[PDB]
Paper text:
To gain further insights into the structure KCCs in an activated, non‐phosphorylated state, we took advantage of an N‐terminally deleted variant of the closely related KCC1 transporter (KCC1Δ19) with deleted N‐terminal OSR‐1‐binding motif H/RFXV (residues 3‐6 in full‐length KCC1 (Austin et␣al, 2014)). In both structures, TM7 and the cytoplasmic halves of broken helices TM1a and TM6b of the core domain (coloured in orange for KCC3b in Fig EV1A inset) are peeled away from the scaffold domains (TM helices 3–5, 8–10 in wheat in Fig EV1A), locking the TMD monomers into inward‐open conformations. In line with an obstructed ion path, the KCC3b‐PM map does not show any densities for cations coordinated by highly conserved residues of the cation‐binding site: Y232, I148, P443 and T446. This interpretation is further supported by density for a putative cation coordinated by the corresponding residues in the KCC1Δ19 structure without N‐terminally “plugged” ion access path. Inspection of the electron density in this region of the KCC1 map suggests that either ADP or ATP are bound to the Rossmann‐like fold formed by β‐strands β1, β2 and β4 and helices α1, α3, α4 of the KCC1 inner lobe. Combined dipole charges from the converging N‐terminal ends of the three helices and multiple side chains create a positively charged nucleotide‐binding pocket. Weaker density for the γ‐phosphate indicates that a mixture of ADP‐ and ATP‐bound particles may contribute the observed densities.
Potassium‐coupled chloride transporters (KCCs) play crucial roles in regulating cell volume and intracellular chloride concentration. They are characteristically inhibited under isotonic conditions via phospho‐regulatory sites located within the cytoplasmic termini. Decreased inhibitory phosphorylation in response to hypotonic cell swelling stimulates transport activity, and dysfunction of this regulatory process has been associated with various human diseases.
Numbering used by the authors:
A (entry chain A), B (entry chain B): 116 to 236, 244 to 881, 887 to 926, 1014 to 1081
Write the structure that this text describes.
Amino acid sequence: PSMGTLMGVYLPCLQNIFGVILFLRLTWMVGTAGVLQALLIVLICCCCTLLTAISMSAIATNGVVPAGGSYFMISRSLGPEFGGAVGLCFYLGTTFAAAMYILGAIEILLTYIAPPAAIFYSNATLNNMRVYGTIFLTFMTLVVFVGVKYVNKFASLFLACVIISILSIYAGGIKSIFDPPVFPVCMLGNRTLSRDQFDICAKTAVVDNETVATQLWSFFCHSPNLTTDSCDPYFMLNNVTEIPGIPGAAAGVLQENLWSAYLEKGDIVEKHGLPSADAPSLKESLPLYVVADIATSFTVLVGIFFPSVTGIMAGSNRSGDLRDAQKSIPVGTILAIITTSLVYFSSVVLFGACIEGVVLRDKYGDGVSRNLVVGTLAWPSPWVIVIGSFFSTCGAGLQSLTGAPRLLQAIAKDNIIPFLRVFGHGKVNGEPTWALLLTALIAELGILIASLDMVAPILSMFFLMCYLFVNLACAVQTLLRTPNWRPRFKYYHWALSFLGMSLCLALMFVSSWYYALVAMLIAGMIYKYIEYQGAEKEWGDGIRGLSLSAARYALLRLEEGPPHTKNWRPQLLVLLKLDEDLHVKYPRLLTFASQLKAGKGLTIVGSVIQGSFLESYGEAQAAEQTIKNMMEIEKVKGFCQVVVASKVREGLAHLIQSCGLGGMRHNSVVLGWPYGWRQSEDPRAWKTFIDTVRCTTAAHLALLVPKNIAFYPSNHERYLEGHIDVWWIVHDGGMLMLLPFLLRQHKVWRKCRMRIFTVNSIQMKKDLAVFLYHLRLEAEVEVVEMHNSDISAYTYERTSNVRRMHTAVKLNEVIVTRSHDARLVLLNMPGPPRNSEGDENYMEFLEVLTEGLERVLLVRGGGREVI
Amino acid sequence: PSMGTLMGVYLPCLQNIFGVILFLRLTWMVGTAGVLQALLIVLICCCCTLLTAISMSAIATNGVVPAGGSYFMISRSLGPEFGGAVGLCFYLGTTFAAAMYILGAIEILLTYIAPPAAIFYSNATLNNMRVYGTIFLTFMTLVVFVGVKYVNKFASLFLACVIISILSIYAGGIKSIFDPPVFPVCMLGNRTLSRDQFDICAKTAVVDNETVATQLWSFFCHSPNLTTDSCDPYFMLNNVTEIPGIPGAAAGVLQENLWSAYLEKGDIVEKHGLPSADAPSLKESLPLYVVADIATSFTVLVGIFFPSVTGIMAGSNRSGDLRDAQKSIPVGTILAIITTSLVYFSSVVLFGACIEGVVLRDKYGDGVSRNLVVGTLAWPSPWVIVIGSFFSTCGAGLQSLTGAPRLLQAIAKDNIIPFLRVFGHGKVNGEPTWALLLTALIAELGILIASLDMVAPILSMFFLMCYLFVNLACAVQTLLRTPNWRPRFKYYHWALSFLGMSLCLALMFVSSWYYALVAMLIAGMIYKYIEYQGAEKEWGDGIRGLSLSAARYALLRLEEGPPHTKNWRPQLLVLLKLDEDLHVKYPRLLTFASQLKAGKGLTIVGSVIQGSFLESYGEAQAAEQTIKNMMEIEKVKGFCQVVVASKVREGLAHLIQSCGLGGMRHNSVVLGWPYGWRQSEDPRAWKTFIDTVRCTTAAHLALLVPKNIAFYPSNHERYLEGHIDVWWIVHDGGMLMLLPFLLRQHKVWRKCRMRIFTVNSIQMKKDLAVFLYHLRLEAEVEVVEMHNSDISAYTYERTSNVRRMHTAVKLNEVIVTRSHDARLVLLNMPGPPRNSEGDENYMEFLEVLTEGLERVLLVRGGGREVI
Ligand SMILES: *[C@@H]1O[C@H](CO)[C@@H](O[C@@H]2O[C@H](CO)[C@@H](O[C@@H]3O[C@H](CO)[C@@H](O)[C@H](O)[C@@H]3O)[C@H](O)[C@H]2NC(C)=O)[C@H](O)[C@H]1NC(C)=O
Ligand SMILES: *[C@@H]1O[C@H](CO)[C@@H](O[C@@H]2O[C@H](CO)[C@@H](O[C@@H]3O[C@H](CO)[C@@H](O)[C@H](O)[C@@H]3O)[C@H](O)[C@H]2NC(C)=O)[C@H](O)[C@H]1NC(C)=O
Ligand SMILES: Nc1ncnc2c1ncn2[C@@H]1O[C@H](COP(=O)(O)OP(=O)(O)OP(=O)(O)O)[C@@H](O)[C@H]1O
Ligand SMILES: Nc1ncnc2c1ncn2[C@@H]1O[C@H](COP(=O)(O)OP(=O)(O)OP(=O)(O)O)[C@@H](O)[C@H]1O
Ligand SMILES: *[C@@H]1O[C@H](CO)[C@@H](O[C@@H]2O[C@H](CO)[C@@H](O)[C@H](O)[C@H]2NC(C)=O)[C@H](O)[C@H]1NC(C)=O
Ligand SMILES: *[C@@H]1O[C@H](CO)[C@@H](O[C@@H]2O[C@H](CO)[C@@H](O)[C@H](O)[C@H]2NC(C)=O)[C@H](O)[C@H]1NC(C)=O
Ligand SMILES: [Mg+2]
Ligand SMILES: [Mg+2]
């Protein structure tokens, strides 16, 4: 399968864009709104479609392109929810478009081709439209049922007819510039008379050597004798002129019809710039003037014109039979859009500058003798545009009735929405069976309105909803960094899709707010229903399934990307120690964690249970429930893991290195202090502690070792007088300065004074102060003398056993004489020794250091802390 | 702190609800819209506020009630995002309400109290309103700045004045029924003359024994002599009547003014039911008829009336100083609402049935000699209502200017929105300083409009937005089962909150669609900004923080509730085996998992690395990256865990029992088969396999042991001819029937025929078929003979070593002669023995069973499978 860009993307998109709105409703729109506002309408309606084409190209380039059609790409690149919601709005738009094309062909048949055939001679026109539209819809449905092959064969002919029509229009204009046609329109003062009835527009004619009243007189004056004075004042007071209706292109005409002329329902189409002496008038004369049919505005014209720029999704419709789709879909679509936009602009200016401003406003060509107003300027004859538009409308109706059921069948066989499974019951060949009937029924329900000017806004609403959803999906997926979404289009940026969504939403609300609300509610309902059904199909439950799907999506999206945050906040893993009877030994660790997190962040609570898994599952479940209850009491929102190991050491290690799912990992381990390690003889008291410390420093995790956890305050407790003391010695400054702030952020330490003690002094104070300004703690800074010999233990261990104890006891003396009355004391601990045997000496160091302090918390940095 | 329900909730809510709209704009609304549509407006505007009061009660009962005010409850019970968004709309509503009350007091001062004081004598009224409103706003701001204590002291007086006003109105009506007042209104045909200028309404009066033209003549006719014929035709053609303006209560008047009388801008207030002979008229007479001031409709009246039922959040405003708030806030609020609604209904009917339908439509009381139209019926004098409404408006303005800056200061000190931190810089006493200035500026910007009929819809938009957000939050949090949200209100149901949200949204869009769009965009912007800032504060990054917060919220919400799903879908844990050089040994396990999941669900991929953590972290990270790449290649979306253990057995156990976060856990373990176990001498080949099997059967997890994994198809492979074979023997029927369906759902097995082989036969076939109908697989069912002796191994092991082999070899013979050419064969495996030593015999059994089959997959149920 291989066909080029032109005959694969360009010509189908062109054939789908050029429609009936141009012939039947371009001149009327231009005359009612002027040339300027018409150009503005065309620009506004082309910008939304151009931004949507850019977003569609960004969709069509990422990855491989599915070979099914234009609905499979959207789904594959935006998810079943979005794609399903988009597909239904597009289906409804297409079926209503079929209805509109049938209505247009009926109007062209009953008004210009053969008026005598109308059955009903107000509401007679509406009933004729209803009857003939129903007959046409039935026959077209039968044709599509039996003869799809001939339609696909003859589809080129309709495009040939459209192109020949446009060429003839432009040839007629260019011939108009130097030698225009003749189409006299008659005038009464500054009113417009219907030339259909009268033989000639003249008050009196000379027959048999004398003057006699003409048909215009007998129609306006009921008396057939000139010597009468019982007629309306407007006829006798004003003259009767015959101005040419097609003045050749000039700068005087384009200057005349350049400003808006919005009429009201029932008003008279008047030629601004003719002498008129006002006077009352009878009520038997109104059937002789041309009348405005519907109320005209700006939003009305926007709504009526928009369905003439839709069809940009028809270019990416032979995706399977394409040579290189990534390079052939976007360029073809955008070139088709540009060609259509330039043709519309040129045609607006040409109509404005070539035709009278009073014959453009005859929606049905009443001033002229019931001709196609746009067909008046055409070189060969006004008969080429009539037949051309008739065949174009028939072909567009046939193609819409062919392409809507196929899309419905695709959506039904995709098994997204479950209640429309029957609509996928295709024939033996694949041609839909019970989707054609539903489509014909919806098209009939649309035909029953029987007025293009009322069917067009619904069509516009559905297509605008589809475009808005495509744009919004693209922008959001680009912003939030979805895992499988990376488009390769060059001229693409999420700002463009966002602007397109905004513009098409503005249009959707300008046309009719209530229709837009109904469309938005339908779209939201289908989106949520697709999401719920997908959740129930993946997991098993509806609501819990929704939560599981949201969690999985967030974790998967969070997986990709740089795994480092610009800031550092403690996300703890509280290693609780269960008793022999499975009771929490130190329930104050959970309280302290709740005070340090304040209910925001991640807090996992692990614990190891010695034994064997094969025979100890119930114990694990019971302990998990116990920890969950104890954790609910202390008001800390977190998860709870319980593992059953053979030795507690390896259980602790596995718990430290494996807790979380992907990016939701901990980065801080808060373990308690071993009590009675030197009292008892069992050496294992302090080996587990040292091993967990060494295992949490090799994973680059922070460390919080709250000593004397039995004296820490509870949540009901409150502090009124007291001062936190910080004793940052050398390293770990960031966290030593960030912990007391996050601590005092709690009501228990809501107003505890902070004092920063740091073992040129003025320069150091200035730096600490400038750093504190960003934090805003403003705690008093007191820098005591720094003796390198005393601090040689921290410097030597980071980057002499007898000396170690000396320095630790001198440091302890200083801290206990200058910080004894402190509420909470925070100081950083030195790293454990490299030699696995000096652990006793390291423990003695750590014990003699914090001698006397009532409550002391030791923090060890991980090294990856930034702030 | 303890005060009752009445003086703590009822009276403040009552004082906040009864406003100026009732006096200044009740009669006008009733006359323009009739009695029926007025009652409908009151009902529509009371239903939204009643449903909002029910939702607010449901909020006020769950948990403890914060003692701060009415904004802390909403925040504490709905989250910082919702509460912050609600607080700002409420602040804007309150400040614009202050503007409206100042405008009302100005109107009452310049129109009835003292008209000569107006500075400008159209736009003179607007300029007078602007100047005087600015002066009033300045003086009121200064008073609130200096004298809050006196305001809080005197707040009771304003309620006393309002109550006395209403009592006087009703006393006047009841006195009207039997002896009404005198207020003659003059008429011209069926037009309404302004009685202010004329001395008496009579064409001619008799002075000095003869008739002379009266002031009405000289005002309507410029000639002061009766003998003139140069006047307008309407004056001479019609009469001059003097009808009473206050007809006592009767059923004839309530019948007259019962249908709508919507006028247009500039129309004349006409008395339907008086003789009038039409005629043209001059243009110097229009300043003498009463005129309609603004265009009236239904939506206009809805918008103008709505700010008279707002203030239901003022009852829950002394939460701290309450005896028992859970029982005192809801009953008080709802009783205040009911009292206000009944007073409005009774007043609408009383006005309709007591006053002429032509003097109700004088917005400024022009027909009467510039009196308060509602003050005409009042027993003591019309002077009590004027002064009462003046003092009420002044008091309401003062209280709004006192209560808006306090709310802004609370929001600013809560540190939710960061850019308004300055507005919390209260005085030494707490009274706001730079929040009062901002509030006064916004109120001035609102005063510059200087028309109640244009300020009221903005107020309505803000309050409706606040109410809609409260209702939506309540309904959603009740539906999705938020963890900390359980209200105790009896008459509360999420359907009521949903209906309230719908009704108040309908109102918000009926009044003015564009205003509603602006309000909704403001609310959404503030919601998303609060969410982003909170994410950046909890975690550290903006976008990644958003993802982390969504994941944590979903997991926490999913934690609570029954942990069993009605359906069972496999969520796998693929235990890969890494090589000595850290390469995936069997990369086909990942392919098979991707074919069985099809990219939807949870798939964790664990692996154990022997060694020691203290010295093997880089190996773990490298292996994790390797597995991530290999898993991305095979197109399976899952997480990857790597642990470093000392012995692979306990690593596998810890991986089996601890993988996931809360509810996102696996329920199926897919491990491979040990190859070369009998070939090599190392006994550990089959001990790890048996141990993992026994460890995964004690955790109640399913088990998938794909044998001969080297012959399984790849993703590029396709199958055209072949038939899946199922050999369900006794147990594990649900999963043995669900696995092939989920398998064939993949394109690789898209059309492989399924054959169900099952070792009364007709009854069994009928049951299997009925079960298959729901699945819809419709696979052919062939039931072979079931010999109990051969099946004695499965029956004896679930619920003789020589016999075991016999039965296994006979079963293998049957399966290999009737299923040799099968594509994939699925049969359930028996459980491992209880005796830890018969493992060799169990392995020999499992090996001799699947002898000859090219591809065989064995499944073992967990026992908790439902479908
Ligand atoms: C077509 O002829 C009709 C009827 O002869 C013209 O209607 C009349 O046009 C004159 C302007 O030339 C209007 O006079 C102006 O009226 C406005 C508002 O009343 C006033 O402010 C101006 O100072 C001036 O008096 C006149 O009202 C209008 N007649 C009616 C009944 O409205 C019409 O303008 C002619 N031209 C068109 C339609 O382009
Ligand atoms: C107040 O007096 C005014 C002027 O005298 C009345 O206006 C005129 O009322 C009559 C009805 O009694 C209208 O006649 C009707 O007009 C409609 C539509 O044109 C027609 O369908 C009916 O068959 C009938 O002819 C007349 O049009 C109207 N005059 C104008 C200029 O509109 C008015 O109705 C009196 N009563 C009120 C306002 O309650
Ligand atoms: N079985 C366990 N499960 C979870 N965490 C543990 C376990 N054992 C120890 N820990 C962690 O190590 C810390 C040190 O406890 P450790 O057992 O060393 O001291 P102890 O229990 O107070 O008594 P001793 O020091 O005499 O053994 C505990 O607070 C806990 O954080
Ligand atoms: N180190 C490991 N990490 C993760 N999973 C493992 C590990 N070792 C074994 N397993 C699991 O157990 C299964 C059995 O593998 P096992 O080592 O028993 O057989 P083998 O490697 O094929 O060779 P042999 O049977 O001779 O040892 C593996 O497929 C895997 O699922
Ligand atoms: C009606 O048509 C006539 C014919 O063109 C207009 O012109 C008038 O012709 C008479 C004949 O001599 C002259 O006396 C008048 O002076 C002409 N009018 C002007 C303005 O020159 C006539 O004006 C038309 N009437 C109206 C109301 O347009
Ligand atoms: C104007 O007022 C008079 C006084 O009430 C109306 O009544 C007419 O009075 C004259 C005096 O004899 C009678 O002849 C007429 O028959 C009375 N009218 C009727 C209907 O009985 C008079 O009708 C008023 N005019 C209008 C237009 O309402
Ligand atoms: Mg120990
Ligand atoms: Mg082994």
